[PDB]
Amino acid sequence: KVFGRCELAAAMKRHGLDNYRGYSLGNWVCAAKFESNFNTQATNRNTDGSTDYGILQINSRWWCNDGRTPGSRNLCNIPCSALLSSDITASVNCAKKIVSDGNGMNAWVAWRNRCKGTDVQAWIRGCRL
Amino acid sequence: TEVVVAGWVASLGDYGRVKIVKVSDREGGAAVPVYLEAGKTPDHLFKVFAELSREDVVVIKGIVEASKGVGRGVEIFPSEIWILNKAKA
């Protein structure tokens, strides 16, 4: 599913991301935009054998289980297909654990490279929430 | 600007393309993030990231930069990582 910007904004607010750990909703929409172009089905295989799955590109080494990466912890306790659905619940619940890990949103290259320090609330501009 | 920092490992995080080691000075306080990024960090460092565990003493060489945004600290992009403390059996 390829979310609309405002659609996802609403979807993320309803799932409790706004100000979660002090990151306002614009951050989360902004990360989705650059991690996965909003595509819930986005997957990306890294040269080390891990894969990043879903709208927030959660990595398979520590965070979910996809069977095809050695010595893998499954800290989010879910299969990596659960992250490829239209229902972003699983992705969101896993993002919560990640962002609580001690590094906030620094867990995400795309957020780091393209959203951090910017006018992130621009990403909820024009949204009816 | 290249730089050398030293201290103990406060936390390790593996997020796939980004791996973060937080290095802390003897008497606590700030803990500086060191970022290993798959596009950019030299290959061998990943191997040593996988050897690191909490409270290990490291000497890290790398580039220091100011963090983006108003949360106004510093970030380090390593070119070498050395482990100082007694080796595990």
Author numbering:
A (entry chain A): 1 to 129
B (entry chain D): 19 to 107
Kindly provide excerpts from the paper associated with this entry:
In this study we have designed and tested the properties of a new protein scaffold based on the OB-fold of the aspartyl tRNA synthetase (AspRS) from the thermophile Pyrobaculum aerophilum. To demonstrate the amenability of this new scaffold to engineering for new binding specificity, we developed a series of OBodies with increasing affinity to a model target protein, hen egg-white lysozyme (HEL). Sharing a common range of epitopes centred on the HEL active site, these OBodies were also found to be efficient inhibitors of HEL activity.
Surface plasmon resonance (SPR) analysis with immobilised HEL and purified OBodies identified binders of moderate affinity (best NL8, KD = 35 µM). To investigate both the nature of the OBody-HEL complex and provide a structural platform for further development of the domain as a scaffold, the crystal structure of OBody NL8 in complex with HEL was solved to 2.75 Å. The concave β-sheet binding surface of the OBody wrapped around the HEL target and inserted β-strand one (β1) into the HEL substrate binding groove. The active site of the enzyme was occupied by R35 from the OBody, in a manner similar to H60 from the known HEL inhibitor YkfE. Interdomain contacts made around the edges of the binding face were made by wild-type residues. The NL8-HEL interface made no apparent use of the four randomised positions in L4 of NL8 (out of a total of 17 distributed throughout the domain), which immediately suggested that the recruitment of L4 into binding interactions might be a viable strategy for affinity maturation.
